[PDB]
Amino acid sequence: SHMSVSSLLEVVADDLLKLNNNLKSLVGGKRLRPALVFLVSRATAELAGLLELTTEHQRLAEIIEMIHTASLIHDDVIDDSGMRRGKETIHQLYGTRVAVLAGDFMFAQSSWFLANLENIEVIKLISQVIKDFASGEIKQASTLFDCDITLDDYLLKSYYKTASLIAASTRSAAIFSGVSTAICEQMYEYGRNLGLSFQVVDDILDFTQSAEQLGKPAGSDLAKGNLTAPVIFALQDEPQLREIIDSEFSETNSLATAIELVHRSGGIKRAHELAREKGEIAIQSLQCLPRSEFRSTLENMVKYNLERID
Amino acid sequence: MSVSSLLEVVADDLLKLNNNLKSLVGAENPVLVSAAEQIFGAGGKRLRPALVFLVSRATAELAGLLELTTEHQRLAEIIEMIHTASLIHDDVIDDSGMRRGKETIHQLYGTRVAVLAGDFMFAQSSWFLANLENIEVIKLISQVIKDFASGEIKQASTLFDCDITLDDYLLKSYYKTASLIAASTRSAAIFSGVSTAICEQMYEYGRNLGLSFQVVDDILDFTQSAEQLGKPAGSDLAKGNLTAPVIFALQDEPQLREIIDSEFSETNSLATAIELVHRSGGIKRAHELAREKGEIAIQSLQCLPRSEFRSTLENMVKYNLERID
């Protein structure tokens, strides 16, 4: 459902099971983003001398996931441009008005929650994430099938898409704990580099799953012209790959060829390394924190993400 | 009564604002830039920034301030940006194809891009406002943006519903229009540092003027010609948005209910309905509803000293009720 009330219920239930788990190990996706907020909140709260999470920490986890979920809802809206007739019909058929209103309300409820936490630094940080998301998503169609994309441009795109919200959420959790600016910056870098690692791994998985399904991989990133880390690395070595993409896989079975050129090029292995390198930056970001079950879980999130392609 | 003659006492403030509006979306996303100019250049009256300047100057003088603060000036720009973002989403939801002779953002670029553009402008507005560092105003405006979404959901959930009460119509009208105006005039007083009591009076001026604005707009959808609006007369009615003239008309012309329930499934039934609205006392009763809100607006200005700014704030009420637009 597109429901704020359902979202908040599921986040509180997921956070309860996570909290109770972490209590049992003391000193030993809709869930990732609130979990990261909760873990960073707990680690930094203990450093600041707080005896429990503040109301600001608890609402932050709901604010972040509401932004994430509203983003998906709005990104999913159909492009009706060009139709001379029957737009009201296609919007009825796909529930466009409901998606727009649900996304609008969820964004607004999130921003209203955040404003009422009264930390202007966090409001600035999160507002910027939303602007960059919307602006980035407007330009995304114009970058499909463009082999002139660089690796730095891909990482920036993945930042605005994914990593920026996660980095803003871990910095904000530290800000609400009142730890030093230096520690808030490190939590920001944890979130940013975990987010990039997470996105590169998701891009690797989309490719390697694509290359094993039995039908034509028609809905893969590569097929739609969304060129990710394995492909970009491959394009450095594969002149026929580039020509094939520029053709939008016009020729019968060219998509299959493109996929095998990518697997050929070792760019998958170089994408592995890139995701591993961002992960190790994320882990290094946590060492300003003392040993705790919360730091060990934040470190393990990186390793468990990387094991997804191991 | 000309819009220019009405606003001349803040003409210089408005000209600065109009020069700056373009750059406030940025220079880096050409589609986003182009979609912004499409609304900013379409010829809006800029009444909302004018109200911010008038209240800003009236309350600044009462407080002892020398000139208008940069916060006053940025507030005015933010209010017009929020207004613009809400028009963009309202066009998507209404599936309107035209706004002031020009095509709407979603017609040019598709529903998804129009929604994202509005998302950007709401976020850009909040971000600019946060950089004014006043948390009271930040919380006020974040409530306004939620109110827009609450209003849009209520509006879409009650299309063609002839059991709508006048109280629900005024609530919807607050969510759609008057909430933003009430918050903009309260925020202008806040940035001048005047008393809580005067701040609250300014909120109520903006609320009641906004409600009077929207009632008159809903009247004009019936009473003005089909290209004096661009849209044909009764466009709100035809899409099932029942406004004050229709609500009053329904009390005397029960066939209106049959036509509206049918969603005008039958040829010339919309023409029939519009004649029923005119036949009833409806348009006249909606006009006195607007006047009654306008009078409460003028009462809320009496806590200000006499000043050319107060006089123009009162004239805005009279201009609206005389309006042909």
Curated annotation (Swiss-Prot), chain B:
Homodimer. Involved in providing solanesyl diphosphate for plastoquinone-9 (PQ-9) formation. Isopentenyl diphosphate binds at residues 45, 48, 83, 100. The keyword Protease does not apply. Keywords: Chloroplast, Isoprene biosynthesis, Magnesium, Metal-binding, Plastid, Transferase, Transit peptide. The chain holds residues 91 to 414 of 414 of the full protein. Its cofactor is Mg(2+). It catalyses: 7 isopentenyl diphosphate + (2E)-geranyl diphosphate = all-trans-nonaprenyl diphosphate + 7 diphosphate. Mg(2+) 2 binds at residues 90, 94. This is Probable solanesyl-diphosphate synthase 3, chloroplastic. Mg(2+) 1 binds at residues 90, 94. Its main location: plastid. Binds 2 Mg(2+) ions per subunit. An all-trans-polyprenyl diphosphate binds at residues 99, 176-177, 214, 231. The keyword Nucleotide-binding does not apply. Its EC number is 2.5.1.84. It is found in: Plastid, Chloroplast. GO terms for biological process: isoprenoid biosynthetic process; plastoquinone biosynthetic process. Belongs to the FPP/GGPP synthase family. One of its GO terms (cellular component) is chloroplast. One of its GO terms (molecular function) is all-trans-nonaprenyl-diphosphate synthase (geranyl-diphosphate specific) activity.
